[PDB]
Design an enzyme around this catalytic site. Structure first.
Site, PDB file in Angstrom:
ATOM      1  N   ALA A 162       0.813  -1.132  -0.076  1.00 55.32           N
ATOM      2  CA  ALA A 162      -0.033  -0.028  -0.071  1.00 55.32           C
ATOM      3  C   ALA A 162       0.848   1.236  -0.121  1.00 55.32           C
ATOM      4  CB  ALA A 162      -0.928  -0.039   1.164  1.00 55.32           C
ATOM      5  N   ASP A 220      -2.959  -8.721   2.367  1.00 54.35           N
ATOM      6  CA  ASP A 220      -3.671  -7.523   2.983  1.00 54.35           C
ATOM      7  C   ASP A 220      -4.281  -8.229   4.022  1.00 54.35           C
ATOM      8  OD1 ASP A 220      -5.505  -5.498   3.729  1.00 54.35           O
ATOM      9  OD2 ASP A 220      -5.945  -5.078   1.657  1.00 54.35           O
ATOM     10  N   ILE A 221      -3.737  -7.656   5.255  1.00 56.98           N
ATOM     11  CA  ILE A 221      -4.174  -7.850   6.708  1.00 56.98           C
ATOM     12  C   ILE A 221      -5.714  -7.923   6.972  1.00 56.98           C
ATOM     13  CG2 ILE A 221      -2.143  -7.369   7.714  1.00 56.98           C
ATOM     14  CD1 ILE A 221      -3.435  -4.830   8.955  1.00 56.98           C
ATOM     15  N   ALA A 256      -0.156  -0.591   8.625  1.00 56.71           N
ATOM     16  CA  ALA A 256      -1.132   0.293   9.274  1.00 56.71           C
ATOM     17  C   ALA A 256      -1.114   1.166   7.941  1.00 56.71           C
ATOM     18  CB  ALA A 256      -0.497   0.982  10.441  1.00 56.71           C
ATOM     19  N   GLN A 257      -2.387   1.776   7.713  1.00 57.22           N
ATOM     20  CA  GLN A 257      -2.532   3.275   7.102  1.00 57.22           C
ATOM     21  C   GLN A 257      -1.659   4.260   8.327  1.00 57.22           C
ATOM     22  OE1 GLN A 257      -2.855   6.394   5.606  1.00 57.22           O
ATOM     23  NE2 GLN A 257      -4.261   6.355   7.603  1.00 57.22           N
ATOM     24  N   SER A 298       1.036   4.872  18.297  1.00 56.26           N
ATOM     25  CA  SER A 298       1.688   6.180  18.082  1.00 56.26           C
ATOM     26  C   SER A 298       1.720   7.139  19.113  1.00 56.26           C
ATOM     27  CB  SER A 298       0.512   6.858  16.732  1.00 56.26           C
ATOM     28  OG  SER A 298       1.233   8.209  16.464  1.00 56.26           O
ATOM     29  N   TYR A 302      -6.730   8.300  12.816  1.00 51.56           N
ATOM     30  CA  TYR A 302      -5.558   7.473  12.745  1.00 51.56           C
ATOM     31  C   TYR A 302      -5.104   7.302  14.523  1.00 51.56           C
ATOM     32  CZ  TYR A 302      -0.529   6.763  12.966  1.00 51.56           C
ATOM     33  OH  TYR A 302       0.675   5.921  13.200  1.00 51.56           O
ATOM     34  N   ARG A 327       8.264  23.465   2.240  1.00 47.99           N
ATOM     35  CA  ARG A 327       7.130  24.237   2.920  1.00 47.99           C
ATOM     36  C   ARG A 327       6.754  23.835   4.286  1.00 47.99           C
ATOM     37  NH1 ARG A 327       2.234  20.561   1.038  1.00 47.99           N
ATOM     38  NH2 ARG A 327       1.554  22.565  -0.225  1.00 47.99           N
ATOM     39  N   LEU A 374      -6.162  19.602   9.307  1.00 44.52           N
ATOM     40  CA  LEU A 374      -6.833  19.159  10.108  1.00 44.52           C
ATOM     41  C   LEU A 374      -6.495  17.630  10.460  1.00 44.52           C
ATOM     42  CD1 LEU A 374      -9.805  20.245  11.219  1.00 44.52           C
ATOM     43  CD2 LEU A 374     -11.007  18.400   9.510  1.00 44.52           C
TER      44      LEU A 374
HETATM   45  N1  LIG Z   1       7.201   6.663  10.894  1.00 45.83           N
HETATM   46  C1  LIG Z   1       6.781   7.209  11.825  1.00 45.83           C
HETATM   47  O1  LIG Z   1       6.926   8.554  12.202  1.00 45.83           O
HETATM   48  C2  LIG Z   1       5.758   6.654  12.785  1.00 45.83           C
HETATM   49  C3  LIG Z   1       6.112   6.638  14.138  1.00 45.83           C
HETATM   50  C4  LIG Z   1       4.792   6.077  14.970  1.00 45.83           C
HETATM   51  C5  LIG Z   1       3.891   5.154  14.437  1.00 45.83           C
HETATM   52  N2  LIG Z   1       4.377   4.564  13.071  1.00 45.83           N
HETATM   53  C6  LIG Z   1       3.924   3.191  12.894  1.00 45.83           C
HETATM   54  O2  LIG Z   1       4.804   2.460  12.344  1.00 45.83           O
HETATM   55  C7  LIG Z   1       4.553   1.566  11.416  1.00 45.83           C
HETATM   56  C8  LIG Z   1       5.222   1.452  10.411  1.00 45.83           C
HETATM   57  O3  LIG Z   1       5.165   2.624   9.534  1.00 45.83           O
HETATM   58  P1  LIG Z   1       6.375   3.363   8.673  1.00 45.83           P
HETATM   59  O4  LIG Z   1       6.763   4.512   8.951  1.00 45.83           O
HETATM   60  O5  LIG Z   1       7.417   2.256   8.451  1.00 45.83           O
HETATM   61  O6  LIG Z   1       5.593   3.655   7.188  1.00 45.83           O
HETATM   62  P2  LIG Z   1       5.418   2.652   5.836  1.00 45.83           P
HETATM   63  O7  LIG Z   1       4.061   3.245   5.440  1.00 45.83           O
HETATM   64  O8  LIG Z   1       6.830   2.574   5.256  1.00 45.83           O
HETATM   65  O9  LIG Z   1       4.947   1.202   6.508  1.00 45.83           O
HETATM   66  C9  LIG Z   1       3.795   0.707   6.637  1.00 45.83           C
HETATM   67  C10 LIG Z   1       3.606  -0.591   5.977  1.00 45.83           C
HETATM   68  O10 LIG Z   1       2.421  -1.164   6.057  1.00 45.83           O
HETATM   69  C11 LIG Z   1       2.036  -1.625   4.876  1.00 45.83           C
HETATM   70  N3  LIG Z   1       0.633  -1.783   5.038  1.00 45.83           N
HETATM   71  C12 LIG Z   1      -0.494  -0.997   4.838  1.00 45.83           C
HETATM   72  N4  LIG Z   1      -1.566  -1.368   4.992  1.00 45.83           N
HETATM   73  C13 LIG Z   1      -1.529  -2.755   4.835  1.00 45.83           C
HETATM   74  C14 LIG Z   1      -2.458  -3.624   4.835  1.00 45.83           C
HETATM   75  N5  LIG Z   1      -3.794  -3.499   4.656  1.00 45.83           N
HETATM   76  N6  LIG Z   1      -1.884  -5.050   4.724  1.00 45.83           N
HETATM   77  C15 LIG Z   1      -0.519  -5.297   4.591  1.00 45.83           C
HETATM   78  N7  LIG Z   1       0.351  -4.301   4.613  1.00 45.83           N
HETATM   79  C16 LIG Z   1      -0.113  -3.077   4.884  1.00 45.83           C
HETATM   80  C17 LIG Z   1       2.498  -0.780   3.774  1.00 45.83           C
HETATM   81  O11 LIG Z   1       2.608  -1.188   2.342  1.00 45.83           O
HETATM   82  C18 LIG Z   1       4.072  -0.514   4.564  1.00 45.83           C
HETATM   83  O12 LIG Z   1       4.837  -1.619   3.995  1.00 45.83           O
HETATM   84  C19 LIG Z   1       3.105   1.891  11.389  1.00 45.83           C
HETATM   85  O13 LIG Z   1       2.228   0.972  11.903  1.00 45.83           O
HETATM   86  C20 LIG Z   1       2.754   3.299  11.516  1.00 45.83           C
HETATM   87  O14 LIG Z   1       1.578   3.689  11.763  1.00 45.83           O
HETATM   88  C21 LIG Z   1       5.116   5.461  12.301  1.00 45.83           C
HETATM   89  O1  LIG Z   2       6.208  19.178   3.925  1.00 49.16           O
HETATM   90  C1  LIG Z   2       5.860  18.993   5.116  1.00 49.16           C
HETATM   91  C2  LIG Z   2       5.295  17.973   5.616  1.00 49.16           C
HETATM   92  C3  LIG Z   2       5.150  17.901   6.950  1.00 49.16           C
HETATM   93  N1  LIG Z   2       5.500  19.020   7.733  1.00 49.16           N
HETATM   94  C4  LIG Z   2       5.519  19.064   9.276  1.00 49.16           C
HETATM   95  O2  LIG Z   2       6.233  17.907   9.599  1.00 49.16           O
HETATM   96  C5  LIG Z   2       5.738  17.213  10.930  1.00 49.16           C
HETATM   97  C6  LIG Z   2       5.509  15.719  10.943  1.00 49.16           C
HETATM   98  O3  LIG Z   2       4.572  15.243   9.852  1.00 49.16           O
HETATM   99  P1  LIG Z   2       4.735  13.924   9.331  1.00 49.16           P
HETATM  100  O4  LIG Z   2       3.329  13.584   8.175  1.00 49.16           O
HETATM  101  O5  LIG Z   2       6.161  13.801   9.017  1.00 49.16           O
HETATM  102  O6  LIG Z   2       4.283  12.946  10.893  1.00 49.16           O
HETATM  103  P2  LIG Z   2       3.002  13.082  11.729  1.00 49.16           P
HETATM  104  O7  LIG Z   2       3.495  14.209  12.781  1.00 49.16           O
HETATM  105  O8  LIG Z   2       1.819  12.968  11.335  1.00 49.16           O
HETATM  106  O9  LIG Z   2       3.285  11.856  12.567  1.00 49.16           O
HETATM  107  C7  LIG Z   2       2.344  10.982  13.176  1.00 49.16           C
HETATM  108  O10 LIG Z   2       2.102   9.814  12.369  1.00 49.16           O
HETATM  109  C8  LIG Z   2       3.307   8.642  12.239  1.00 49.16           C
HETATM  110  C9  LIG Z   2       2.959   7.907  11.589  1.00 49.16           C
HETATM  111  O11 LIG Z   2       2.904   8.324  10.038  1.00 49.16           O
HETATM  112  C10 LIG Z   2       3.391   8.238  13.858  1.00 49.16           C
HETATM  113  O12 LIG Z   2       2.549   7.737  14.417  1.00 49.16           O
HETATM  114  C11 LIG Z   2       3.747   9.664  14.414  1.00 49.16           C
HETATM  115  O13 LIG Z   2       4.024   9.131  16.189  1.00 49.16           O
HETATM  116  C12 LIG Z   2       2.765  10.676  14.592  1.00 49.16           C
HETATM  117  O14 LIG Z   2       3.050  11.777  15.378  1.00 49.16           O
HETATM  118  C13 LIG Z   2       4.267  18.213  11.069  1.00 49.16           C
HETATM  119  O15 LIG Z   2       4.501  19.002  12.214  1.00 49.16           O
HETATM  120  C14 LIG Z   2       3.933  18.696   9.572  1.00 49.16           C
HETATM  121  O16 LIG Z   2       3.236  20.000   9.885  1.00 49.16           O
HETATM  122  C15 LIG Z   2       6.191  20.322   7.282  1.00 49.16           C
HETATM  123  O17 LIG Z   2       6.618  20.858   7.895  1.00 49.16           O
HETATM  124  N2  LIG Z   2       6.219  19.996   5.749  1.00 49.16           N
END
Ligand SMILES: NC(=O)c1ccc[n+]([C@@H]2O[C@H](COP(=O)([O-])OP(=O)(O)OC[C@H]3O[C@@H](n4cnc5c(N)ncnc54)[C@H](O)[C@@H]3O)[C@@H](O)[C@H]2O)c1
Ligand SMILES: O=c1ccn([C@@H]2O[C@H](COP(=O)(O)OP(=O)(O)O[C@H]3O[C@H](CO)[C@H](O)[C@H](O)[C@H]3O)[C@@H](O)[C@H]2O)c(=O)[nH]1
Ligand SMILES: NC(=O)c1ccc[n+]([C@@H]2O[C@H](COP(=O)([O-])OP(=O)(O)OC[C@H]3O[C@@H](n4cnc5c(N)ncnc54)[C@H](O)[C@@H]3O)[C@@H](O)[C@H]2O)c1
Ligand SMILES: O=c1ccn([C@@H]2O[C@H](COP(=O)(O)OP(=O)(O)O[C@H]3O[C@H](CO)[C@H](O)[C@H](O)[C@H]3O)[C@@H](O)[C@H]2O)c(=O)[nH]1
Lengths: 312, 311
Positions: B34, B56-57, B79-80, B121, B146, B204, B272
């Site tokens: 995804a 797909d989970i 995850a999404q 998260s 989310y 930006r 939002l």
């Molecule tokens: N990156 C961050 O800042 C951060 C921190 C906290 C939480 N998270 C969590 O960490 C995990 C990994 O995210 P990431 O940053 O590696 O992003 P990512 O998008 O690279 O990883 C998510 C993965 O889940 C897969 N996936 C999504 N929907 C699926 C489905 N229905 N079935 C099977 N696979 C599916 C995607 O294809 C992808 O490989 C997620 O659970 C995300 O919510 C991300």
């Molecule tokens: O072009 C951009 C895009 C984003 N941002 C800023 O960067 C910060 C981080 O945004 P991200 O989309 O990189 O990540 P999130 O803050 O949405 O992350 C959230 O979702 C993640 C999963 O994708 C994790 O779960 C994490 O813990 C949770 O805070 C925000 O303040 C956003 O306003 C910018 O300044 N410029």
């Protein structure tokens, strides 16, 4: 006001519909008849103030429905209701109770709904709690998928409250009973006992019969729904019960007394998912809503047995 | 041990796969691509200790898959991930993040799995928290679908722990960045800044660019996953971050120093669902898991920028 009740063809739902109609509201009832019955609403056929929509909250176009009917308050009672069923199929339970709730909230935030009144489960969301009777301040600690989906439902609605200012309150009933409860299922013990004893059919308790629940009469629950539908208790969950514990064995005795039948239940094995004790602290509902339960178990049970006796 | 990683083709997921294999585990990776990328796993083609399943989970026969592979620990990262997407389509987000987690738990409890390590998260579940840095004792208060689904996932896993004794721990990362993060994804600010500044394309900030986050490097996050996979911290959530705040604007300067050249971004409207502040108390992870972050922002940004530059 304009009101919409999901799960309107059900036990509590149809009772709520009647109350809202009596209070002068226009009501849309919504149900897919998963466990509800058209007979619960058939007396409303020629009431112009009531409109029924057959819809599944999981897949129906709720946006379209709400756009048409423009409810001010949505009373969300549609759910998978059986704890054991939730254990057997947690995905289905989560679909109806979580996804259904999410879809409804997403529709509602778009159509100018003022408030959603959610139905939680005061009886199960706390799991095995730190204290009895259990206040709303106690942490949720669900131990069945049913309880978990109810918790998740609250949280999503709280989220939509933050996001869009869509107001919500959560009615969290204990064990509701009374007229219209289905006697032919595995949930709804008062109904099960009443009809079986009236019919001279076997009854049973589970484990050693010492499990307790807090039995609250349907009319009392309905009153709490109506009170919380106003701009009162915004954001809050309310335990809706009596704060008195009745064991499975004690319940059987009470129903047998009301029927005037034998008090000799069978003893069957425990059921996975069922908590041992449940008793709610109902102080917050008193303070905020002015709500108190009026119906004691003996009187409620009598009224329930009469319902079965009069049934046509 | 035998491990299964959902979301294994993803940023954190593929990195965790590499770590587990290095630690001598056999790994099954599961993903539907995804947002994940095959290139994150392509080096594993010939490694027999690794098996990949496209699934797909939400819909796959997870029971059959877990029955076949018999993982001892399931690392649940699928995850999404996009907050804004969760606002656009809360139902879809809930389907993947809640239903998907429920289906995984139901499969796991039937297939002798010892523990599920959930990914929550840390950055979003507390909403606007009562204090900073935010401890796990702070109540969850999600302000996006989310965040809500992540909380619901935790609660369902806690439920399965009570019901069936299926052990679980919740890794709650802050803002994870580093190599393999999608430069062309919608989430991942460090990736966005790095990619854009390297390309000479416009950068930006949303709002006035005062929104802060806790930036934690991928390798540190992976280590926390490994630590919590043992018989420790059962039923508990661990905030995984640095406990240091960096604003949307201050990050840009760090990336530009690493990339080279200009340091002047634009300023677009707030979005939002996005919170204003985020900083995690990481004391519990230290005390219970012995986990501490090794990589400071400046060093992690250098690494990330270098990686993106090399491509
Ligand atoms: N990156 C961050 O800042 C951060 C921190 C906290 C939480 N998270 C969590 O960490 C995990 C990994 O995210 P990431 O940053 O590696 O992003 P990512 O998008 O690279 O990883 C998510 C993965 O889940 C897969 N996936 C999504 N929907 C699926 C489905 N229905 N079935 C099977 N696979 C599916 C995607 O294809 C992808 O490989 C997620 O659970 C995300 O919510 C991300
Ligand atoms: O072009 C951009 C895009 C984003 N941002 C800023 O960067 C910060 C981080 O945004 P991200 O989309 O990189 O990540 P999130 O803050 O949405 O992350 C959230 O979702 C993640 C999963 O994708 C994790 O779960 C994490 O813990 C949770 O805070 C925000 O303040 C956003 O306003 C910018 O300044 N410029
Ligand atoms: N009875 C209790 O002890 C008690 C107390 C606490 C919680 N509750 C909650 O009260 C509410 C009403 O329960 P009840 O006791 O009246 O049982 P019920 O089965 O009579 O009511 C549930 C109603 O929801 C309908 N429904 C189910 N799935 C649906 C779907 N996908 N789309 C549309 N309609 C659907 C059913 O057909 C039924 O009419 C439920 O939310 C239940 O979880 C019950
Ligand atoms: O033939 C029977 C059926 C039930 N019981 C006993 O009756 C009690 C109540 O069981 P129900 O199935 O009637 O109801 P639940 O306790 O499962 O009710 C739960 O689910 C409800 C939704 O239907 C509400 O959410 C409520 O708050 C929550 O406690 C249990 O202790 C059970 O052991 C019997 O003794 N004999």
């Amino acid at each position: 006001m304009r009101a919409l009740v999901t799960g309107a063809a059900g036990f509590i739902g149809s009772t709520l519909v009647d109350r809202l109609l009596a209070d002068g509201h226009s009501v849309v009832g919504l149900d897919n008849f998963a466990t509800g019955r058209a007979t619960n609403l058939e007396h409303l056929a020629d009431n112009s103030a009531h409109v029924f929509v057959e819809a599944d909250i999981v897949t129906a176009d709720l946006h379209a429905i709400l756009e048409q009917h423009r409810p001010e308050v949505v009373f969300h009672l549609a759910a998978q209701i059986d704890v054991r069923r939730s254990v057997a199929d947690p995905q289905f339970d989560a679909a109806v109770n979580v996804i259904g709730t999410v879809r409804l909230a997403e529709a509602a935030r778009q159509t100018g709904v003022r408030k959603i009144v959610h139905t939680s489960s005061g009886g199960s969301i706390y799991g095995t709690p730190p204290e009895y009777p259990t206040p709303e301040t106690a942490p949720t600690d669900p131990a069945s998928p049913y309880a978990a989906g109810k918790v998740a439902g609250e949280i999503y609605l709280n989220t939509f409250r933050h996001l869009y200012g869509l107001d919500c309150s959560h009615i969290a009933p204990a064990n509701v009973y009374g007229p219209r409860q289905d006697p032919h299922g595995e949930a709804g013990v008062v109904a099960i006992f009443a009809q079986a004893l009236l019919s001279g059919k076997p009854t049973r308790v589970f484990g050693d019969g010492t499990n307790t629940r807090d039995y609250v009469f349907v009319d009392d629950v309905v009153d709490a729904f109506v009170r919380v539908s106003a701009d009162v208790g915004g954001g809050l969950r309310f335990n809706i019960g009596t704060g008195k514990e009745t064991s499975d064995r004690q319940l059987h005795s009470a129903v047998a007394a009301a029927v005037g039948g034998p008090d000799d239940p069978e003893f069957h094995p425990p059921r996975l998912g069922d908590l041992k004790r449940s008793c709610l602290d109902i102080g917050l509902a008193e303070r905020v809503l002015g709500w108190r339960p009026q119906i004691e178990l003996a009187d409620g049970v009598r009224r329930t047995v009469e319902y079965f006796r009069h049934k046509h």
